[PDB]
Design a protein around this ligand. Structure first.
Ligand SMILES: Nc1ccn([C@H]2C[C@H](O)[C@@H](COP(=O)(O)OP(=O)(O)OP(=O)(O)O)O2)c(=O)n1
Ligand SMILES: Nc1ccn([C@H]2C[C@H](O)[C@@H](COP(=O)(O)OP(=O)(O)OP(=O)(O)O)O2)c(=O)n1
Ligand SMILES: Nc1ccn([C@H]2C[C@H](O)[C@@H](COP(=O)(O)OP(=O)(O)OP(=O)(O)O)O2)c(=O)n1
Ligand SMILES: Nc1ccn([C@H]2C[C@H](O)[C@@H](COP(=O)(O)OP(=O)(O)OP(=O)(O)O)O2)c(=O)n1
Lengths: 197, 199, 198, 198
């Protein structure tokens, strides 16, 4: 018996690469706010943790800050996944899944998370599977080419992201592909693929 | 309802400074392993996580490795706190409480955990309070003086602890006192204070 | 049970950027003062606190004065939110919510409020939520474009606001939108969006 | 009805100058924790506001930091004053009253709080007075001489307090006296005077 078990409605997760337009997509559901629990733009949380901008720290110094950043992401996802609601539908930008299967895996591959950090995160992930209910009935996948995602990143010009190369978006694209198209992860619910190009 | 709620027996937590003799104290319950759930010596997990020595890394490079270390410690305690058991008594060495109120706080004060690392841990702690049941019926506090703790640490001579100064033990001591004697933490359960300075 | 809880009639909040025409819009209800509790334009209070002009001090030296300024705003908002009335309707210019979600947040982002100052405001907001009932049934959002709000500010020529750039209104605009259109903020009640570009 | 009205046990406030021994005195009630709501040593909060040491910022730069410092002290006192409890006795170290009648007043008199900052804090106090219930049935005054207070402060050697002059303890002593001995403040409940020079 996990925390939040039996307390959650049908849940949609909006996934896709950086700059795939997840927030822009979720904005369309604004009029329906009375019947949908909408939990959007988690990134504003990660830029302001009682004043501290973890996102900024992460990109500057990933070998020191990537583990607390991803730890804090994991938490905010958990807080959203388990938030109470009397509404019959919940829709969320991202999830604990993209953190684990995409961004944490990529940061291990590129070396920003050393084994000890990766290990600590994965052991947390495993304990979270045992202890906390994560409701997920549909994933909407906003699929893009790495190049379109990079354009939207350059256009948006978030300062924290000023040094993000195309290769990093290519790496992240393949991981989203591995999970959402090629069924290479143990999760595990329905997926609707949308062309966001 | 929280995870592990209603699943846990009377639970005793053995607390005290580094080198206070917590494992030794818990050792004397071994002969009753079949009547008691004993979860002892968590430091052994921290020294080998799929081969990685987080304790050693923390001590060598706290500013990089203190956050992931405490985050792993928090996990191992939660793993122990929520462990299912068919016995009427559980006794554990340490708790999530001393990682939070003593070690994480001291690493904050000393600069080992930057403010965004500390805030991340604190935010995790608040969410753990909401989501995970931590059974705590009695705390046994092996109260020592920092000098006695320090001597036992030098005797034991763990390579990881080779550079630990007495000042750190004094800091840790006052924090255990603030929590277990002076009831300065929101945590409240019965405390039994033993003199752990003798033989 | 909170202070003012169950004491308040249906309550409307008028919100919008600086210069968006909140007091003007509220002036239309003047003739109905006897059936409506009308609380406008709070800036008159911030310009004269027993003779101290805090709005002017804040613009001149924000690193020292932004914090007691927003603290006073918060207080005058609470005074209005909880002000007693035997009328069936209350209408108010601004609210505690815009101070928190728009003005305090922007002063944090621009450095006017150092961290300890922002933390202190936020912790107060958390306590106020626990202790004080803030009736909020409808927000009327006077939606303007930054350039239109800026022109009105220049036309008006309050001396306190003489150094306010267009950029600042652009930041405040995005924060009103984030709150009132995109509902990124915890507080929810119905919002009526009006075009106040004229 | 004010917030927390009717929810509070008989409440004892422990007051005295800096270094008068309030925490030490309160330590004596530790064994009775299960029957007494004990709220001690609030200075640990003022030193770690999500990692920010407001106490240190105030002493370093009082003209900038004294206002948010006292604003936060006031909050913490309110959080304690209104904390729920099933216990039949509540004992708190310090109170909102001493922030207002002693420390805020002295920082006004020495210039650390300029008029508009002081005005903001006082207007808040008046609102708090109307909206929040503060239970206070007995004040225990640990009376000292400024010299004993000053010696204890030097001996404790808190880094934040290293530049604290004797004059400042003299000023604070007289304000506590004004309030707790000479009945100069609007507030009244019973006062128990104790010689803490011992
Ligand atoms: N587990 C995660 C999640 C996000 N990020 C980073 C990548 C970006 O720098 C920033 C925001 O990325 P998202 O794709 O989550 O949010 P966007 O605002 O980019 O999404 P969109 O533009 O699609 O609305 O956070 C990260 O490092 N690890
Ligand atoms: N939250 C924690 C818990 C422990 N430690 C460190 C301090 C020591 O370097 C090591 C083990 O300390 P403990 O007091 O937990 O265990 P001991 O085996 O030293 O206890 P005893 O000697 O009393 O059996 O881990 C830490 O940094 N953070
Ligand atoms: N929490 C707040 C509220 C207002 N202000 C500032 C912005 C202006 O300099 C002045 C008043 O702005 P308002 O938008 O509240 O009032 P106006 O009178 O400008 O509104 P309108 O022109 O729409 O009537 O106070 C501030 O710094 N912080
Ligand atoms: N409204 C207040 C209350 C306290 N302080 C400051 C003065 C000291 O620098 C510090 C702590 O003082 P207290 O007298 O409240 O606490 P102590 O711990 O010194 O009390 P004691 O030593 O008597 O237990 O906070 C302040 O500036 N304003």
């Amino acid at each position: 018996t996990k925390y939040a078990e039996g307390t959650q409605p049908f849940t949609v997760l909006i996934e896709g690469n950086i700059g795939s337009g997840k927030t822009t997509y979720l904005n369309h559901f604004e009029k329906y706010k009375n019947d949908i629990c909408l939990l959007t733009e988690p990134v504003e949380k990660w830029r302001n943790v009682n004043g501290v901008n973890l996102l900024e720290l992460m990109y500057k110094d990933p070998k020191k800050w990537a583990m607390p950043f991803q730890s804090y992401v994991t938490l905010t996802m958990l807080q959203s996944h388990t938030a109470p609601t009397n509404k019959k539908l919940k829709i969320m930008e991202r999830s604990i899944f993209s953190a684990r299967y995409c961004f944490v895996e990529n940061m291990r591959r590129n070396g920003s998370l050393e084994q000890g950090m990766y290990n600590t995160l994965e052991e947390w992930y495993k304990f979270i599977e045992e202890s906390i209910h994560v409701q997920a009935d549909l994933i909407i996948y906003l699929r893009t080419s790495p190049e379109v995602a990079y354009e939207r990143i350059r256009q948006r010009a978030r300062s924290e992201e000023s040094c993000v190369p195309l290769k990093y978006l290519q790496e992240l694209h393949e991981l989203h592909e591995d999970w959402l198209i090629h069924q290479r992860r143990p999760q595990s619910c329905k997926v609707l693929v949308l062309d966001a190009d």
